[model samples]
Target chain A: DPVFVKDDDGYDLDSFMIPAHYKKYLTKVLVPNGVIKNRIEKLARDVMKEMGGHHIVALCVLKGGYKFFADLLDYIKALNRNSDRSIPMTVDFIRKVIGGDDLSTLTGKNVLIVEDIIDTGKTMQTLLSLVRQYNPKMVKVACLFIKRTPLWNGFKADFVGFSIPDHFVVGYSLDYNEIFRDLDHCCLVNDEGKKK
Target chain B: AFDPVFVKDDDGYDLDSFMIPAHYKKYLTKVLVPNGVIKNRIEKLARDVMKEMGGHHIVALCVLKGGYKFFADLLDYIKALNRNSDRSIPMTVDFIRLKDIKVIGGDDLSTLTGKNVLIVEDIIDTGKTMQTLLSLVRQYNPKMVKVACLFIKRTPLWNGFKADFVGFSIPDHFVVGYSLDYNEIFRDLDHCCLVNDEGKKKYKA
Candidate 1:
């Protein structure tokens, strides 16, 4: 069974309107929009330092990583504007398993795996092994959210934005039935959203 | 349809909602900005927008991910100003992320055709980003397009362009908080501050 968790107590979305149509489907803003912006900025700085200030291939896991990847690159580019030691970045987004770019040609070049979250850690491991096989200079992971549960305790990412609770979330490019990806904040999907 | 979620009133916002986080205070060298000044400054910007472009519907396209807070608050104030007045400035919301000013993700700009466009940006320095963005918006053949920046930094004369509406003109310095970020950590802070040396290097990657 695809794990379904109930009711993650989060912030009510009364601050603003939700396109009217999307109101029924969204319940709470699990992570506010500003929180996401701040986290990505920090992650960008850390990524530049840890990756040895060299150019790297940013592999974006699609659907979910779209929002995070774009913002991360923006922040990284901002830092590079002034810093003497700057990180140059290129990008390629993948769908589910296979998306784009040739990892084999990236041999000896640093590769970064960017995704939305890590639940069981299997998906991350799969992409990592794929990049690893190509003999890249170094492989590092940057994830926006890493769920906290007994499933994989103490497992770390090179860059982890939010240590969110294990509540099957959506928004900021995370989706429920391919919807809510456009939502600005992390929101809880109501039962109506699940069924619809 | 838009009358879904409701707030108590325009003044009903929480002052502590945007206050500096307890942990974030240690890193600051100077709180350059005065308390609650942002809220007051933005009201004037919103009012000015209404005063200049009365009786027009706008497509408020936010320049993400830095402009999220600015975009949110500006729109709220625009709503408030309109609610207090004729409410003629009906606004549609959208966001786009750009690196080197390419529209990477967010809304499709096709809907902006024959509509007014308002570009909500967090801050500006070189002006190339907003310059490129304005060029892109022109492709949509919008009735009118304008840039509203929350913060403006004095940049090299040869490399800069002016925003149509600016909330604050800041001195050239490294500051963080209220959408300007330092390693993305201080964005949670309410006001802008210069970061001390130790604080800057503490989270250096």
Candidate 2:
């Protein structure tokens, strides 16, 4: 029975045991449900405050980031109610390569890439490089999870929901072999789970 | 005592006052359609458009500069028509420039998805610009697309394009007035006029 341990800094140090249904392949839960939402809302507030302009584009990485991207936008719109300087936002989804095309809407505008997770950082780096050619006023990345790995090089997300361990995780849009993606919370998967 | 053929206004300007400038009399041959006639035609055009597209909201995209004045009048006429109708036609408008079009990065255009779209243009010349714009708008998957052009020159339009709403079908002559400029002049003229060679020569660089 995995137990909840509270950290002095209010960090959730508890590890969740794999539920009976998913125990056939999963190991444990690294992050719970409410923690992710709270962190994502906070990240939205930070990005909204930092980007103080009239126009911003939330370019979401497709498939995985869709859920997180929409949630962030909702939180920002709600939190910005008291202020009169609320900016107009547009949402876009990136599936693959972004360069070699005329993205006139992004020209002279700020772009914010909403991503699900950053692992080796290679994909994010490649995407950022492609988006840079359009000459957007600024480009920033916001990801739900950032795996603490040395391979990330110097690339860092401007807003991150969680700093997770280097584990093969599934759920909340993350998947292994395209399965277990429908799970609501992030769960740690072992080698057997990855194979399954 | 007899009155002069031309009528003068209180400001000592008459119908031919515009001809005071030698270049205007030398270049402009005749007014093809007066301003009041154009407005009346556009009012009817608005009613026709709303009749065909009843009970539907549309996004009206105006081609910039030349189309600005025409679009303004058309939008007002459309609103007035709606006020007297059972189904009010709701419209959202935006301006687009020909040179500013690009193929990517317009997710804001997603608003066009599943909506009816009406493009308002000042004039349709070669139809190339309208062709390209239609292709771009189609990519957003609008339910229906139609065009309203204030004037269309009597020329063979390419790509089988046709303007659904046209105020005038004019013969080929260098024409300018009512938002159409000739060397950056004559745009404020209330009526479309044929520009003669002498007038063209005056503005020749």
Candidate 3:
């Protein structure tokens, strides 16, 4: 087991492990240097390159991947410009409610499910199964980050930015009770030392 | 059961003054008449409210989409009082929309940011709306965010989050007029009155 640390306010650092173990993963390093954006931008470019200048819809999974969707949409447009290709992009939001909350709207759409980070991929599997009933031309997954500890094989993220050890993190569009969505840089949730 | 009291434009002048109180006329000086009777009562109630709230600081939250008018007027009335007195009863206004109580329109506070909150509303009948607001507000933690309304019916609103201040306790009549509009009309009506059977049928049927 790793030793716990504390912040200046004496909040336990064990809870906020995002930064503490950031270096152990390759995706963590790739994110800082713009690899995620660049790669996403190139993916759009390649698709556009083959299409001879046609715009495909960009389906955004809401609340979680807002930052990634926003940044990648911008990067995709910029990359197309450099390639002298003008591919139009459209964005839509998909909402998921657990335990009979309702997923009726996701039934039929050519969707690109974008996520900030993935841990178990359970949510993703459920989403795909439901969305497939609508007969979407394609359901592509674009995740800014993922966790590598799952035991399952044959399950993979189609487009991934980074992969890191499992940690409960906040900021950069991932949050608990809507706090860290505004944090420019991602941080681990340090809950142990602080009084809950 | 609750209903509004209203008079037609053709009604005698004496009929108008009876519904409006003497101090209410003075209160109306700062009030926006465009706000209907429903709005007026809520504003008046908020203006007249005094609680042993321990502190004058309050954050007034308005449930939106429908509460736009009543919420703004109530804030204006509260702020007018704060301006004259030396006691700093500073009031801030925020909005939280609800399709259901579990999901509010915006951020949830665990503690009312350590300040008191006064939830202002246009009417209270079944009190479901007010109760939902209370439970949702409780999650964010607050000093004391009591409920207030422009109108209340005699039928008990069997639920939590009682209104700390109430303006008018109306009859069980189905009423409209003044700012209380059905399907977004008559929001500009100056007085409160029952909806005609034709209008009532339209709303229900």
DockQ of every predicted complex? 0.02, 0.00, 0.01
lDDT of 3 at A102: 39
Q: Which stretches of model 2 miss by more than 4 angstroms?
A: A1-196, B1-23, B65-67, B100-107, B156-159
**lDDT tens readout by residue for model 2, A115-179:** 78878877778778888988888888888888777576757677776676666778666773456
Chain B only, TM-score of each candidate:
0.80, 0.80, 0.68
Which candidate leads the pack in lDDT? 1
For candidate 2, the share of real interface contacts preserved is: 0.00
Q: How many clashing residue pairs are found in candidate 2? A: 0
Q: Tens digits of per-residue lDDT for model 2 on B1-205?
A: 0110111111111223121234466667655544644664576577666766646877778877543678889888888777888766667777777774732223245577776777888877888888888888888888788888887775655456677777666765667766575656775566566677777887678
On residues B1-205, what C-alpha lDDT tens digit does candidate 3 reach at each position? Answer: 1122222223211212212323223212211121223343443354445424425678777666363656666667676666766677666666666675433433345536677877767767788888877777877777777876666665554454457775555655555544464665544445455554555555663
lDDT for each residue of candidate 3 in A1-196, tens digit (9 for 90 to 100): 1111122111112111133343222122112212233334444543444432444455566655566777777766666676755655555565644322334444443456666666777767776776677665567776766655655433586666555555555545655345433343444544441222
lDDT tens digits, residues A1-196, model 1?
0111123434555432234577787767666555567557667767776774567888877644467777888887887776876555677777643645455666877788888788878878888878888888889888888777777844577777777677767777776355774577777677887765
Error of 1 at A146 (Å): 1.4
Tens-place lDDT digits, model 1, residues B1-205: 1111111111111222223566866776655443344554565577666666556777787887543777778888888767777455567887777764344334467667877788888877888778888888898898888888777766564265767887666666666777775557765577667677878787688
Estimate the TM-score for candidate 3.
0.39
Worst 10 residues of 2 chain A by lDDT: A1-10
**Chain A TM-score of each candidate structure, as shown:** 0.82, 0.79, 0.61
Worst 10 residues of 3 chain B by lDDT: B26-35
User: Model 3: how far is B61 from its true place, Å?
Assistant: 1.0
Candidate 3 chain A least-lDDT 10 residues: A1-10
